[PDB]
Amino acid sequence: DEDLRFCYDILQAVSRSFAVVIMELDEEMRDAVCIFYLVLRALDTVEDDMSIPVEFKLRELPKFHEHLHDTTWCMSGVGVGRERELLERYTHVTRAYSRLGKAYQDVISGICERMANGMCDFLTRKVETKADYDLYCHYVAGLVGHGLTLLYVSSGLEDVRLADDLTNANHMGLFLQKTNIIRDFYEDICEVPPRVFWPREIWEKYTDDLHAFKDELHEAKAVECLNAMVADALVHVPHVVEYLASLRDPSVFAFSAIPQVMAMATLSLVFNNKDVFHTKVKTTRGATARIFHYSTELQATLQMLKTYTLRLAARMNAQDACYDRIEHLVNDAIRAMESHQ
Amino acid sequence: DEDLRFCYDILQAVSRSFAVVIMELDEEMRDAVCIFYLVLRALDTVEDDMSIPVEFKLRELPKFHEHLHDTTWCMSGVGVGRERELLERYTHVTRAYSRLGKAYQDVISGICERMANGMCDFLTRKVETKADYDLYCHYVAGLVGHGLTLLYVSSGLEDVRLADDLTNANHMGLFLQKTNIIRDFYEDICEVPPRVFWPREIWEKYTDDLHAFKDELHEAKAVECLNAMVADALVHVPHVVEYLASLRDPSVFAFSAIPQVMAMATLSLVFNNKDVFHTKVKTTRGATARIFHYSTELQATLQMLKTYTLRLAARMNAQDACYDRIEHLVNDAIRAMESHQ
Amino acid sequence: DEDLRFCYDILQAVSRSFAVVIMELDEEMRDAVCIFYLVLRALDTVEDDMSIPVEFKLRELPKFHEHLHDTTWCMSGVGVGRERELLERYTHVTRAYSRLGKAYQDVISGICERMANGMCDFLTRKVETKADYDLYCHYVAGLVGHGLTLLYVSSGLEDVRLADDLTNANHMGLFLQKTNIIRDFYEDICEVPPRVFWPREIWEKYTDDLHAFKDELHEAKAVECLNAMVADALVHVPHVVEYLASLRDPSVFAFSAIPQVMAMATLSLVFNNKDVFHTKVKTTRGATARIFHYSTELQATLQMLKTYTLRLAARMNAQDACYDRIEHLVNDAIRAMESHQ
Amino acid sequence: NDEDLRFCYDILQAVSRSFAVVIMELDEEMRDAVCIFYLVLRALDTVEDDMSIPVEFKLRELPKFHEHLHDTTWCMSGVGVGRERELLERYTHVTRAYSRLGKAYQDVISGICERMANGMCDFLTRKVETKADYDLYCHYVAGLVGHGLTLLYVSSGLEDVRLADDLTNANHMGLFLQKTNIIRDFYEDICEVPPRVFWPREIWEKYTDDLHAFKDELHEAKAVECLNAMVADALVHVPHVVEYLASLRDPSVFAFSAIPQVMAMATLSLVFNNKDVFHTKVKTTRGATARIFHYSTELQATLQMLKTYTLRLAARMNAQDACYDRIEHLVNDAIRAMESHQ
Ligand SMILES: CO[C@H]1CN(c2ccc(C#C[C@@]3(O)CN4CCC3CC4)c(Cc3ccccc3)n2)C[C@H]1O
Ligand SMILES: CO[C@H]1CN(c2ccc(C#C[C@@]3(O)CN4CCC3CC4)c(Cc3ccccc3)n2)C[C@H]1O
Ligand SMILES: CO[C@H]1CN(c2ccc(C#C[C@@]3(O)CN4CCC3CC4)c(Cc3ccccc3)n2)C[C@H]1O
Ligand SMILES: CO[C@H]1CN(c2ccc(C#C[C@@]3(O)CN4CCC3CC4)c(Cc3ccccc3)n2)C[C@H]1O
Fold first, then answer.
1. Quick one: which residues bind Mg(2+) (chain D) (predicted)?
2. If both were cysteines, with which of B129, C263, C317, D319 could B201 make a disulfide (CB 3.0 to 4.6 Å apart)?
């Protein structure tokens, strides 16, 4: 049990936010999800550490999941801060893991492997196309959507029908991953070395050098490209609405809804906002408190997504080179919401 | 987007402290309040410029709210520092206003006009009586309490019932105002021409010349007069408590509460303190940081109000001439706080 | 095998209650009642869609029933919510419709056309007289009573002579629709475009304008008017009892009684209650669970109707203006009940 | 020539019998501006007043009614009856003439129109409950016209630019007219379908619980007592009317400005404490209005007439009347402002 207690502790240290959201789940499902997160997080720490060789990563990642059955395994020289501690003490995670249902372990083990191999794929190449963008998001986020959806069904909390078509589940992870990639542009490009995720297929029609977006000189093209990125993430909203409307359990719903509403709030804030290029744009502590509070049931959630979707569209005017493109994407999003009201 | 953005930069420039508090709000609520602030600050700038003929103000102020529906109106040789740019480029403010919802525009127009006329009353007469004091404070502060309240409701974030009886919203405005007037005595009286806000009805009981309190040879009376001003100020705390306890939205609550707790902490410092007469008593950067951080919810806000109230009390003597009044005003305050604990 | 599933899926989505009540019935009668509900629900969507031209509705409505055999038809831009998905996919309806006994088929078509042509009549005028009222209610609800009644006969579950005189069957419908109309005043009045159903005749004698009842200043006459609305509704009770007492099949009786008892309970709730003018007044969860549980046989059903009817009366003194008309009406209903006990 | 301008004057004479005469007597230059200004507002009013249209339409169309002033093709197809409807149909002539006016005249007209449109919207979706609502409603439909006309006097050069410094008295001019009509038109209004009410609850709720009660003779004591309160409220603007009139310098502007005020005082003195107000339309004799048009061309004569009408009004009440003290005071205040300019 002490191990399980370490997991929650490391969890809170590594991700304050998700560690509050996870508390919406019932203990059993919560334990499995917490461990699921720490597993992928440790995985993310290896892929991310740019101080270690690529061959080391392509050597360790593919078989990271196998370690789930080695209560003695742990890695010592990788990552920074808490993350680093997660790997050095990965023992607590794996053993906490072994006390999980067999159905949970399998989902976790499988998602971990598929994500790991997907990470290896993008370690030896960059994100050039939209197809690449969507696949990369699938590997790091979309699969977590799949994973969670399978854990929901396995817990019995949700119907078996949920996992029939894991498409909307993939959309769920994509909306969140994309909103973060859009929002963290500056911070990411300021890393050493730079971290780039925006697809060349998209940014290539606004600039020849992404780093140009950091300069006010090219502020018009930066915002124009920011706006195309938002347009690309909006594609997923209708599917996020469908998925959320199919959930029957209150806990699974709150845990699944909150992040999506936070993402829609953020996205509506980064849309057509030049500040995105020099700072981290975020919702107020007041607005996130309100979102966590009301995202416990469908109707309320749909109206908050509605509200934020309406605030997003209200930040533009005919003159913008996206107005038309964004406008129809907003109506699709709104229709789907009203499609359940 | 340049219109609203000018609003925020000027806001930050003209009032940095309140600029931080307004950032507790979000979306359209914040914009409305930002514009509301700028409209009244411009109004106040014109009203305060003593180089402007009283005759001009008497007719121009009452129609100031009318410039709101005229995106070409601006003023050019008025204001101190950044206040000048506000009047000169007022065009941005009115344009941003023209985009708020009709309900927000109305609260803003209405309050501005009512404050303008109230100022006009006091441009042709001094503050002699306590009734005058309360009425003057209602004109420049209480009404802001009224407006903000109407805006909270108009937004939907607080119940439509909050606006039934604006008596307490007025107390909110009067408590902040009186605390400032008390705290800025020295600075206000030490300029050409002297600004007197303390009602004769209170200070005549302690001297023939208010400008004499500066002298360290009339401190005993100055201090006794100060305590009298503090007592008068304390009358409003129970109502502030009541008003705060009726707020449901977290953003609106932080926004509304922070200035109040700051006010109470400042009141506990100037109370029975001679320094007020030769300098500007301010809180520590730590207390300020503390107040801004925890005033996000009722219980914690009340604990701080109680604490500052008790420290205000523990600073007096059974020997001091106000012991009796203050003690009652203090017990009235706490009784009301516990009333919501 | 797949078309009905859509009908049911959409039925539950479109109307949670009647979906539950609809399940009391035995499959044969069930599928028919389900398709019958949808057909009228789609019809109603087009009728109330304040988007489409009043000039256009009249043109089609009469056609609507004909579309029943046009298993390729579908309207794709009408209404909102799950209603839209219903119309755009009306195909599953029509085809599921061609598998029901030719007998069932005709009632649906016959009733639909009559209801359709009834909506057209009112799509041009207003509800002024109590006669306008009964007639309108006859088109939307009354005919449904006929339909369902003619379906009970066809099924062979009820005596073939149950449909000879349909006056009571029409009373079953008006009682439901009228009670709904009374309870939904606010919800209907606060619509854009506004929705009024209360007969000019009844409220001409109480206020000057109908929207006027929203104001708390007029609870006095808003309620008095409400009571006259209830008093009107109560006229149908005796005939609702008469009708339920004639049913012999357990299933038909349950499906037939539950809605009626629910209506009575709501009626006893809205009577002399100003909350009707600013909120949806409704039976508590416990009360409706009991209604569904006990309304399976005449005697228990009569006891529940009596109880509610007696609470309806217990909410007025010799003080009230409708007291006399009410006391009488309550009596007529109770006699009817006692007449079958 | 300018066939467009002739259309404006023919229609003006068809729609407003009252103001057409005073507008027509104006010095040619500013007259067209005033004519076109009246038409625009009357058009706006027609729309707003047609109850056979959805509030949602007006709330959606009135706020932009001023933008058509710059569109020579805009005209409205089917709203309002009589000559009023014909105006909106061929509104193209009004907008056509508007374009040949001085830019300053155009600006004044647009600004007031828009401010009025939006004010009608306000009271389109709510009621006049308080005396504040009353003054405000009168401000949107009449006071603002006083604002504009004043603005038009300055822009015309006929009056001093100083005239427009403080527009408070101008607003008083509008309210005195509008309030007198609302008082005199009580019955006509309340008999409308749907009924029309402008009398503020804050005043009538004190004499009845249902405004329709005054319709019948059984509540005649309270009706009249309420009518008298309304008149009192109206009398509040007279001192200000006097001040505005005494401040005009051009004879043409003065006659055009004064005649309607004198007609209002005359009508007020006749509806006051007069119970016929609740069953018919009380009005001055044609000879009285002819006498008023003839004499109200210079300050002294106007004051004198205003004075006699005010004294005629005060003589209609008795000590036993409730309003005695209130009226007697307002009367004495009006008469005093008149005496200060003599
Ligand atoms: C089906 O609805 C769900 C969709 N959700 C998702 C989707 C994707 C992710 C993720 C992720 C990461 O990219 C971020 N971080 C942790 C796991 C990976 C790699 C580094 C996350 C975060 C996460 C939560 C729980 C376990 C692991 C990861 N959540 C939460 C619900 O809205
Ligand atoms: C309901 O609780 C509220 C009470 N609050 C108040 C009350 C009064 C004022 C003010 C003010 C001023 O006197 C200062 N300054 C700017 C507006 C006037 C004239 C010159 C202000 C400042 C202000 C804030 C936002 C918009 C306008 C003014 N805030 C903020 C909350 O605690
Ligand atoms: C013989 O007694 C019956 C009386 N019942 C009624 C009477 C009327 C209606 C209805 C209706 C509607 O006006 C409401 N809504 C759905 C159908 C029409 C048009 C839009 C409805 C709803 C309905 C239920 C089943 C099939 C169709 C309609 N039920 C159910 C039993 O108590
Ligand atoms: C400066 O003093 C002036 C005050 N006067 C006023 C004041 C108000 C009005 C008016 C008006 C209306 O309410 C009547 N009608 C036409 C314009 C509005 C809306 C529907 C009118 C009518 C009118 C006359 C000429 C042009 C426009 C409006 N006149 C004339 C002078 O005594």
1. 45, 48-49
2. B129
Q: B66 vs A182, B35, B43, B74, B109, CA distance in Å?
A: 42, 15, 12, 12, 8
- Asked if residues D127 and D65 have their Cβ atoms less than 8 Å apart, the reply is no
Q: What is the dihedral of CA A91, A92, A95, A97, to 10 degrees?
A: -120
Half-sphere exposure of D105 (CA within 13 A, CB side): 21
Neighbouring C-beta atoms of residue C89, cutoff 10 Å: 14
Q: Which residues on chain A are in Cβ contact (under 8 Å) with C81?
A: 338-341
Residue A269 is given by DSSP the state H
Q: Give the gap in angstroms from C-alpha A335 to the nearest C-alpha of chain C.
A: 8
| CA-based R_g, chain A, Å | 20
The CA–CA distances, whole Å, from D172 to B117, B339, D142, D231, D243 equal 17, 50, 9, 15, 10
Beta-carbon-side half-sphere exposure of residue A209 (alpha carbons within 13 Å): 7
Contact C82, C14 (CB under 8 A): yes
SS (H, E, C) C213-279: HHCHHHHHHHHHHHHHHHHHHHHHHHHHHHHHCCCCCHHHHHHHHHHHHHHHHHHHHHCCCHHHHCC
CA pair distance A208, B259, nearest whole angstrom? 49
In order, the DSSP letters of D16-66 are: -HHHHHHHHTS-HHHHHHHHHHHHHHHHHHHHHH-TTS-HHHHHHHGGGTT
Q: Structure tokens of D23?
A: 């507008």
Q: Do B62 and D168 touch (CB under 8 A)?
A: yes
In the C/D pair of chains, how many CB contacts fall below 8 A? Answer: 8
Experimental approach was X-ray
b (16+ CB within 10 A) / e for A251-261: bbbbbbbbbbb
Reported as type and span, the H/E element at residue D134 is helix D131-138
Catalytic residue among B90, B97, B136, B175: B136
Spatial distance between the Cα atoms of A46 and A53, rounded to a whole number of angstroms: 10
Instruction: Verify whether residue C200 is a known catalytic residue.
Output: no
Instruction: Tell me the backbone φ, ψ of residue A82, rounded to 5 degrees.
Output: -55, -45
Find, among C258, C119, C268, the residue nearest to C179 by Cα: C268
User: Contacts from C202-210 at CB under 8 Å and sequence distance 24+?
Assistant: C202/C130, C202/C133, C202/C228, C202/C229, C202/C232, C208/D194, C208/D195, C208/D212, C209/D194, C209/D195
Is B136 considered catalytic here? yes
Which of B53, B36, B165 lies closest to B111 in space, CA to CA?
Answer: B36
Please list, in sequence order, all residues whose beta carbon lies within 8 angstroms of the beta carbon of residue C195, skipping any fewer than 6 positions away: C188, C189
Write down the H helix ranges in A156-274. 167-183, 185-189, 200-203, 219-234, 237-245, 250-270
Tally of structural domains, chain D? 1
Query: Searching chain B, which residue's CA lies closest to the CA of residue D121?
Result: B102
A338 contacts in C (CB within 8 Å)?
80-81
- Whole-angstrom Cα distance, residue A39 to residue A122? 19
* Pair of tokens at residue D154: 């300055």
Q: Give me the CATH number covering residue B194.
A: 1.10.600.10
DSSP assignment string, B106-154: HHHHHHHHHHHHHHHHTTSS---SHHHHHHHHIIIIIHHHHHHHHHHHH
Give C138's contacts (C-beta < 8 A, 6+ positions apart).
C118, C170, C173, C174
Resolution (A): 2.3
Which of left, alpha, beta for B200 (phi over 0: left; psi -120 to 50: alpha)? alpha
Rounded Cα distance between D321 and B110, Å, is 38
Residues 6+ apart with CB under 8 A from D297: D251, D254, D255, D258
